[PDB]
Write a protein that holds these residues in place. Sequence first.
Motif, PDB file in Angstrom:
ATOM      1  N   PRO A 142       0.753  -1.254   0.000  1.00 42.84           N
ATOM      2  CA  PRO A 142       0.000   0.000   0.000  1.00 42.84           C
ATOM      3  C   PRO A 142       0.777   1.293   0.000  1.00 42.84           C
ATOM      4  O   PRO A 142       1.893   1.394   0.512  1.00 42.84           O
ATOM      5  CB  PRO A 142      -0.844  -0.093   1.297  1.00 42.84           C
ATOM      6  CG  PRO A 142      -0.067  -1.001   2.204  1.00 42.84           C
ATOM      7  CD  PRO A 142       0.673  -1.965   1.292  1.00 42.84           C
ATOM      8  N   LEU A 174       5.958   1.293  16.702  1.00 41.67           N
ATOM      9  CA  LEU A 174       7.356   0.901  16.579  1.00 41.67           C
ATOM     10  C   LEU A 174       8.135   1.510  15.420  1.00 41.67           C
ATOM     11  O   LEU A 174       7.608   1.635  14.301  1.00 41.67           O
ATOM     12  CB  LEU A 174       7.390  -0.647  16.430  1.00 41.67           C
ATOM     13  CG  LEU A 174       6.595  -1.498  17.388  1.00 41.67           C
ATOM     14  CD1 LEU A 174       6.471  -2.921  16.826  1.00 41.67           C
ATOM     15  CD2 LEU A 174       7.297  -1.558  18.746  1.00 41.67           C
ATOM     16  N   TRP A 188       6.558   7.723  15.227  1.00 46.20           N
ATOM     17  CA  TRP A 188       5.142   7.902  15.561  1.00 46.20           C
ATOM     18  C   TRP A 188       4.932   8.242  17.046  1.00 46.20           C
ATOM     19  O   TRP A 188       3.839   8.723  17.440  1.00 46.20           O
ATOM     20  CB  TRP A 188       4.417   6.657  15.137  1.00 46.20           C
ATOM     21  CG  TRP A 188       4.246   6.381  13.683  1.00 46.20           C
ATOM     22  CD1 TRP A 188       3.222   6.825  12.871  1.00 46.20           C
ATOM     23  CD2 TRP A 188       5.095   5.564  12.845  1.00 46.20           C
ATOM     24  NE1 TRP A 188       3.400   6.348  11.591  1.00 46.20           N
ATOM     25  CE2 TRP A 188       4.528   5.569  11.550  1.00 46.20           C
ATOM     26  CE3 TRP A 188       6.268   4.865  13.084  1.00 46.20           C
ATOM     27  CZ2 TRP A 188       5.080   4.871  10.485  1.00 46.20           C
ATOM     28  CZ3 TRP A 188       6.825   4.157  12.023  1.00 46.20           C
ATOM     29  CH2 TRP A 188       6.252   4.162  10.751  1.00 46.20           C
ATOM     30  N   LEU A 229       1.381   9.361   9.041  1.00 38.92           N
ATOM     31  CA  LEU A 229       1.204   9.330   7.571  1.00 38.92           C
ATOM     32  C   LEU A 229      -0.303   9.616   7.336  1.00 38.92           C
ATOM     33  O   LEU A 229      -1.136   9.350   8.219  1.00 38.92           O
ATOM     34  CB  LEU A 229       1.536   7.952   7.027  1.00 38.92           C
ATOM     35  CG  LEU A 229       2.853   7.282   7.326  1.00 38.92           C
ATOM     36  CD1 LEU A 229       2.777   5.805   6.924  1.00 38.92           C
ATOM     37  CD2 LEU A 229       3.961   8.000   6.556  1.00 38.92           C
ATOM     38  N   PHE A 263      -2.383 -10.405  13.441  1.00 40.86           N
ATOM     39  CA  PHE A 263      -0.993 -10.599  12.981  1.00 40.86           C
ATOM     40  C   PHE A 263      -0.805 -12.028  12.504  1.00 40.86           C
ATOM     41  O   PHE A 263      -0.275 -12.273  11.377  1.00 40.86           O
ATOM     42  CB  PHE A 263      -0.057 -10.026  14.033  1.00 40.86           C
ATOM     43  CG  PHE A 263       1.356  -9.843  13.566  1.00 40.86           C
ATOM     44  CD1 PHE A 263       1.602  -9.064  12.437  1.00 40.86           C
ATOM     45  CD2 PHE A 263       2.417 -10.517  14.176  1.00 40.86           C
ATOM     46  CE1 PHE A 263       2.910  -8.901  11.970  1.00 40.86           C
ATOM     47  CE2 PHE A 263       3.723 -10.361  13.734  1.00 40.86           C
ATOM     48  CZ  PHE A 263       3.971  -9.561  12.632  1.00 40.86           C
TER      49      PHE A 263
HETATM   50  C1  HEM Z   1      -1.723   1.383   4.999  1.00 44.52           C
HETATM   51  C2  HEM Z   1      -0.894   0.423   5.443  1.00 44.52           C
HETATM   52  C3  HEM Z   1       0.563   0.809   5.753  1.00 44.52           C
HETATM   53  C4  HEM Z   1       1.310   1.770   5.193  1.00 44.52           C
HETATM   54  C5  HEM Z   1       0.935   2.761   4.067  1.00 44.52           C
HETATM   55  C6  HEM Z   1       2.613   1.739   5.832  1.00 44.52           C
HETATM   56  C7  HEM Z   1       3.651   2.559   5.485  1.00 44.52           C
HETATM   57  C8  HEM Z   1       4.852   2.550   6.152  1.00 44.52           C
HETATM   58  C9  HEM Z   1       5.983   3.402   5.796  1.00 44.52           C
HETATM   59  C10 HEM Z   1       5.962   4.409   4.625  1.00 44.52           C
HETATM   60  C11 HEM Z   1       6.971   3.129   6.655  1.00 44.52           C
HETATM   61  C12 HEM Z   1       8.397   3.717   6.745  1.00 44.52           C
HETATM   62  C13 HEM Z   1       9.533   2.950   6.066  1.00 44.52           C
HETATM   63  C14 HEM Z   1      10.876   3.639   6.190  1.00 44.52           C
HETATM   64  O1  HEM Z   1      10.981   4.805   5.707  1.00 44.52           O
HETATM   65  O2  HEM Z   1      11.774   2.989   6.798  1.00 44.52           O
HETATM   66  C15 HEM Z   1       6.486   2.117   7.579  1.00 44.52           C
HETATM   67  C16 HEM Z   1       7.223   1.589   8.614  1.00 44.52           C
HETATM   68  C17 HEM Z   1       6.805   0.579   9.447  1.00 44.52           C
HETATM   69  N1  HEM Z   1       5.671  -0.192   9.230  1.00 44.52           N
HETATM   70 FE1  HEM Z   1       3.991   0.540   8.298  1.00 44.52          FE
HETATM   71  N2  HEM Z   1       2.617   0.743   6.790  1.00 44.52           N
HETATM   72  C18 HEM Z   1       1.368   0.166   6.774  1.00 44.52           C
HETATM   73  C19 HEM Z   1       0.940  -0.889   7.552  1.00 44.52           C
HETATM   74  C20 HEM Z   1       1.753  -1.564   8.442  1.00 44.52           C
HETATM   75  C21 HEM Z   1       1.412  -2.792   9.116  1.00 44.52           C
HETATM   76  C22 HEM Z   1       0.100  -3.566   8.899  1.00 44.52           C
HETATM   77  C23 HEM Z   1       2.432  -3.110   9.901  1.00 44.52           C
HETATM   78  C24 HEM Z   1       2.612  -4.344  10.834  1.00 44.52           C
HETATM   79  C25 HEM Z   1       1.482  -4.783  11.441  1.00 44.52           C
HETATM   80  C26 HEM Z   1       3.440  -2.075   9.765  1.00 44.52           C
HETATM   81  C27 HEM Z   1       4.659  -2.057  10.435  1.00 44.52           C
HETATM   82  C28 HEM Z   1       5.629  -1.098  10.281  1.00 44.52           C
HETATM   83  C29 HEM Z   1       6.759  -0.865  11.166  1.00 44.52           C
HETATM   84  C30 HEM Z   1       7.030  -1.702  12.440  1.00 44.52           C
HETATM   85  C31 HEM Z   1       7.465   0.149  10.663  1.00 44.52           C
HETATM   86  C32 HEM Z   1       8.779   0.780  11.198  1.00 44.52           C
HETATM   87  C33 HEM Z   1      10.040   0.117  10.636  1.00 44.52           C
HETATM   88  C34 HEM Z   1      11.364   0.736  10.956  1.00 44.52           C
HETATM   89  O3  HEM Z   1      11.490   1.489  11.962  1.00 44.52           O
HETATM   90  O4  HEM Z   1      12.289   0.389  10.158  1.00 44.52           O
HETATM   91  N3  HEM Z   1       3.003  -1.138   8.862  1.00 44.52           N
HETATM   92  N4  HEM Z   1       5.191   1.784   7.250  1.00 44.52           N
END
Ligand code: HEM
Length: 291
Positions: A142, A174, A188, A229, A263
């Motif tokens: 997504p 996280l 966040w 976001l 999950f």
């Molecule tokens: C609409 C759904 C989602 C979108 C658009 C989204 C988008 C993003 C984006 C853009 C990042 C940052 C990546 C970076 O710059 O390193 C991110 C990080 C992350 N996503 Fe989400 N995500 C979504 C759903 C989820 C789900 C379902 C999970 C797990 C249940 C998740 C877990 C994480 C975690 C843990 C990070 C942080 C990783 C880090 O610190 O390297 N995300 N997500």
Amino acid sequence: LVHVASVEKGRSYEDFQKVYNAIALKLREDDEYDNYIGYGPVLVLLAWHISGTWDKHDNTGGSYGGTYRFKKEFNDPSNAGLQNGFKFLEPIHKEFPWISSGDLFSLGGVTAVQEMQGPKIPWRCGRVDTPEDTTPDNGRLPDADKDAGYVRTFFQRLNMNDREVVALMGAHALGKTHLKNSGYEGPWGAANNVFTNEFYLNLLNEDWKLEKNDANNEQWDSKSGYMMLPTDYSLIQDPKYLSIVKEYANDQDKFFKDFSKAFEKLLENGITFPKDAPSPFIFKTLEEQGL
Ligand code: HEM
């Protein structure tokens, strides 16, 4: 396609608990990563990304095949930054070569969550490495710059309902966004390497200001130094979403239970478990084992 889980030949619970402990000890040890956040968050992201390619329509993608191992999927623009979770697990894989890729990638996620004090996530073994031609095309993950409708629609491809969508998103408590990876910057919340309902509280309680970042993307910025976001923010724009956000902001337990279920479901989408298949395992943490 039909993807039947097939236990790694002659391995049992104890075998898996050892893989788990190996990841956990490495998490504990490599604590300097990303300014001392550690690898926990990247592992959780990796487990979601390998699982999120699933299409309930033709049963393609999902965690079964361990396809992230292939260049195509590995170089998915949406997977930028995941190479770090990958290199973290390699040494582990080398030590326990009998575990399939899909099993390892998904176990890291569980391990990370549990070691970061999240809930216990029941896990099942049996994913089988599939050929490079089963690698899903890019563009199944997504976008961040959309609204609640996009999100609902998207998640439907993965069979997730409103409750599941909101539970899963609390994972945003996280880690943080990295400009270089996604064109977004900032965490966040404050305790970004501890699993709590912080996400929901920040959502409800901060005074969010829409601004454009240096990648020229819009994000919601708070004075506390947090970000959200558009997709995160949309959880409070949609009425159905908002009441669930509220529930979680109010009850960390409820959230833990919902997350847990959601999950595992996410990680098991597209897999058929024969009736003789072993029950889901519940791994002990290092702490519970005195290690
Ligand atoms: C609409 C759904 C989602 C979108 C658009 C989204 C988008 C993003 C984006 C853009 C990042 C940052 C990546 C970076 O710059 O390193 C991110 C990080 C992350 N996503 Fe989400 N995500 C979504 C759903 C989820 C789900 C379902 C999970 C797990 C249940 C998740 C877990 C994480 C975690 C843990 C990070 C942080 C990783 C880090 O610190 O390297 N995300 N997500």
